[PDB]
């Protein structure tokens, strides 16, 4: 179990850690988050009390270094930093734990939610979507645009998700126009899985990362990416059976975790109705169809 | 975006454009089977691809053999249309290729866009105009070449005959759309109007009769009357 200490909390802020959130008052003696499960990526995120504009946060993996948070009064945000002096860091954490000034990652033993949402998400792949090679952790916020959004403007601050475009030469083989547009299996299996992602685990990792950025930061381009990666699978007649079964589990846990009151903005009616009721895979997502019908029957 | 009454003069500017109408591509007769079920029999069809500025019509005849052994023919017909329009564009010299292609039915947008990916600078546009190009098969010479075809064939016509020697392309298109709207609303009456008088003939190299300017005014008035007539007979007004 690892710890992310905070130097202090000088401004009032709602802090998230994965699917959990707590309120810290301005200058309230707060010294970080302990008991963070090892073995998963994590995200620590922020919304200031005085400007709910800009949710922002950091993806990290405690196995890759000792990380802490420190507020910067010039740039006006809580920043993640790495401490290279391991003995300094352990000494800092032990003192903060002795004074009991940290919140405990509040995981229920029965509960696999976070594993289920991050099963295929790897830090190394996050760092290729979010390019800032001098840091071991990755910053994301509400406003960052994707490479594909930038084609339709600062490249260093972009989300480099894999571009998916159903009316593109990459997606459509010359001479197979109708076939490839109506059945996207060659684009899914040959172009994307064999060619770009290499395997379905990397595809699911990017899909899951896109969903989490949409949910935690309201990042619109991430929501677009999540839906495009669902639609590409659902619109393929030929999908390995293990991928369909895994997709059903992935989406089930995403829909289960989504705040009921954000469904209007985070769920695309057209994609979901097409995927569950019209697509080739309309009968392959039983768990997802059941939770959607019981939790969001309005959208459908 | 979409072509409508507001941007109507754009049709007659000097940017090459084509209308594509697919309503006569897949044509069937519905009939009873010996067991009392219903079946369809396809008949030859055509793509109607028209330059509204010059009157040049590229009539691609769709022979019934293209449907043999195929499923979902109404969907296939849109893709076959888009395949043939793309092939036509590729066949034309670069300086003759269109800048825009306007489809008369919105269901042609995605098929045509996908077939024209190699031409990113050709705009594929819908229209809000309800153009009467389905009535092309009421022009006797067009219907004749389609029905007689024994294989796929492209035939080139000028749908304006020689009108552009005397009138502008705006006026020629307005005459064409009026004639076609009339043929669509009451084919029998429209054709009676066009041929009632035996002394006005259709030249061998023309589609419509050789009316003088004054006779075209009478004709056009008779077509408007017919369209209004039928509009009453219909709605009881
Ligand atoms: C009384 C003194 C010995 C500190 S004990 C309070 C532990 C704590 O810091 N909880 C907390 C909860 C939410 C946000 N920030 C902090």
From Swiss-Prot, chain A:
Database matches in InterPro entries: AAR2, AAR2_C, AAR2_C_sf, Aar2_N, AAR2_N_sf
Post-translational modification: Phosphorylated on serine and tyrosine residues.
GO cellular component labels: cytoplasm; U5 snRNP
Matches recorded under CDD domains: Aar2_C, Aar2_N
Key words, A-Z: Cytoplasm, mRNA processing, mRNA splicing, Nucleus, Phosphoprotein
Keyword Nucleus applies: yes
Any GO BP: spliceosomal tri-snRNP complex assembly
Modified residues (Phosphothreonine): 257
Pfam families: AAR2, AAR2_1st
Subunit structure: Heterodimer. Interacts with PRP8 (via RNase H homology domain and MPN domain), competing with BRR2 for the same binding site. Component of a U5 snRNP complex that contains at least the U5 snRNA, PRP8, SNU114, AAR2, SMB1, SMD1, SMD2, SMD3, SME1, SMX2 and SMX3, but is not a component of the U4/U6-U5 tri-snRNP complex.
Other known facts: Present with 7330 molecules/cell in log phase SD medium.
UniProt similarity note: Belongs to the AAR2 family.
Identification of the protein by name: A1 cistron-splicing factor AAR2
Organism: Saccharomyces cerevisiae (strain ATCC 204508 / S288c) (Baker's yeast)
Source organism phylogeny: Eukaryota, Fungi, Dikarya, Ascomycota, Saccharomycotina
Gene name of this polypeptide: AAR2
UniProtKB/Swiss-Prot annotation, chain B:
Subcellular localization: Nucleus
Positions of region (RNase H homology domain): 7-237
Highest taxon of the lineage: Eukaryota
UniProt comment concerning the protein's domains: The MPN (JAB/Mov34) domain has structural similarity with deubiquitinating enzymes, but lacks the residues that would bind the catalytic metal ion.
Further details from the record: Present with 468 molecules/cell in log phase SD medium.
Function noted in UniProt: Functions as a scaffold that mediates the ordered assembly of spliceosomal proteins and snRNAs. Required for association of BRR2 with the spliceosomal U5 snRNP, and the subsequent assembly of the U4/U6-U5 tri-snRNP complex. Functions as a scaffold that positions spliceosomal U2, U5 and U6 snRNAs at splice sites on pre-mRNA substrates, so that splicing can occur. Interacts with both the 5' and the 3' splice site, as well as the branch region. Has a role in branch site-3' splice site selection. Associates with the branch site-3' splice 3'-exon region. Also has a role in cell cycle.
The protein's assembly and partners: Component of the U4/U6-U5 tri-snRNP complex composed of the U4, U6 and U5 snRNAs and at least PRP3, PRP4, PRP6, PRP8, PRP18, PRP31, PRP38, SNU13, SNU23, SNU66, SNU114, SPP381, SMB1, SMD1, SMD2, SMD3, SMX2, SMX3, LSM2, LSM3, LSM4, LSM5, LSM6, LSM7, LSM8, BRR2 and DIB1.
Protein name, per record: Pre-mRNA-splicing factor 8
Whole sequence portion shown: 1836 to 2069 of 2413
């Amino acid at each position: 179990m690892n710890t992310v200490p905070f130097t202090s909390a000088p401004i009032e802020v709602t802090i998230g850690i994965d699917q959990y959130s707590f309120n810290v008052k301005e200058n309230q003696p707060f010294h970080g988050i302990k008991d963070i499960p090892i073995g998963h990526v994590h995200v620590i995120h922020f919304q200031h009390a005085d400007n709910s504009s800009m949710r922002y946060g950091y993806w990290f993996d405690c196995r890759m270094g000792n990380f802490y948070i420190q507020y910067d009064p010039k740039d006006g945000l809580y920043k993640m930093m790495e401490e290279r002096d391991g003995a300094k860091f352990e000494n800092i954490v032990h003192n903060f734990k002795e004074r009991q000034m940290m919140v405990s990652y509040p995981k229920i033993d029965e509960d696999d939610t976070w594993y289920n949402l991050t099963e295929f998400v790897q830090m190394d792949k996050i760092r290729k979507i979010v390019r800032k090679d001098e840091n071991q952790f990755s910053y994301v916020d509400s406003s960052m645009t994707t490479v594909q959004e930038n084609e339709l403007s600062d490249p260093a601050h972009s989300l480099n998700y894999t571009v998916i475009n159903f009316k593109s030469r990459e997606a459509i083989r010359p001479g197979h126009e109708m076939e490839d547009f109506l059945d996207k299996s060659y684009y899914l299996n040959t172009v994307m899985l064999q060619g770009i992602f290499k395997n379905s685990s990397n595809y699911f990792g990017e899909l899951q990362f896109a969903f989490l950025n949409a949910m935690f930061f309201g990042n619109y381009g991430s929501s677009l990416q999540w839906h495009a990666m669902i639609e590409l699978i659902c619109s393929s007649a030929t999908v390995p059976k293990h991928m369909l079964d895994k997709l059903d589990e992935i989406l089930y846990y995403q829909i289960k975790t989504l705040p009921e009151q954000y469904s209007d903005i985070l769920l695309n009616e057209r994609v979901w109705n097409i995927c569950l009721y019209s697509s080739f895979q309309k009968n392959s997502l039983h768990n997802t169809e059941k939770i959607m019908e019981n939790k969001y029957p309005e959208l459908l | 975006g979409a072509m409508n009454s507001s941007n109507y003069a754009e049709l007659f500017n000097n940017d090459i454009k084509l209308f594509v109408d697919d309503t006569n591509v897949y044509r069937v007769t519905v009939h009873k089977t010996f067991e009392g079920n219903v079946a369809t029999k396809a008949i030859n069809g055509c793509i109607f691809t028209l330059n509204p500025k010059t009157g040049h019509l590229f009539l691609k005849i769709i022979h019934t053999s293209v449907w043999a052994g195929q499923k979902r023919l109404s969907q296939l017909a849109k893709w076959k249309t888009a395949e043939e329009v793309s092939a036509l564009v590729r066949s034309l010299p670069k300086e003759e290729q269109p800048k825009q292609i306007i489809v008369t039915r919105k269901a042609m947008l995605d098929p045509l866009e996908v077939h024209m990916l190699d031409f990113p600078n050709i705009a594929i546009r819908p229209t809000e105009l309800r153009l009467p190009f389905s009535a092309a098969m009421s022009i006797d010479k067009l219907s004749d070449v389609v029905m007689k075809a024994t294989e796929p064939q492209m035939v080139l016509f000028n749908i304006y005959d020689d009108w552009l020697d005397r009138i502008s392309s705006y006026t020629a298109f307005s005459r064409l759309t009026l004639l076609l709207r009339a043929l669509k609303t009451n084919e029998e009456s429209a054709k009676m109007i066009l041929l009632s008088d035996p002394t006005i003939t259709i030249k061998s190299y023309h589609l419509w009769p050789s009316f003088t300017d004054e006779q075209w005014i009478t004709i056009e008035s008779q077509m408007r009357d017919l369209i209004l007539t039928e509009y009453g007979r219909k709605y009881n007004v």
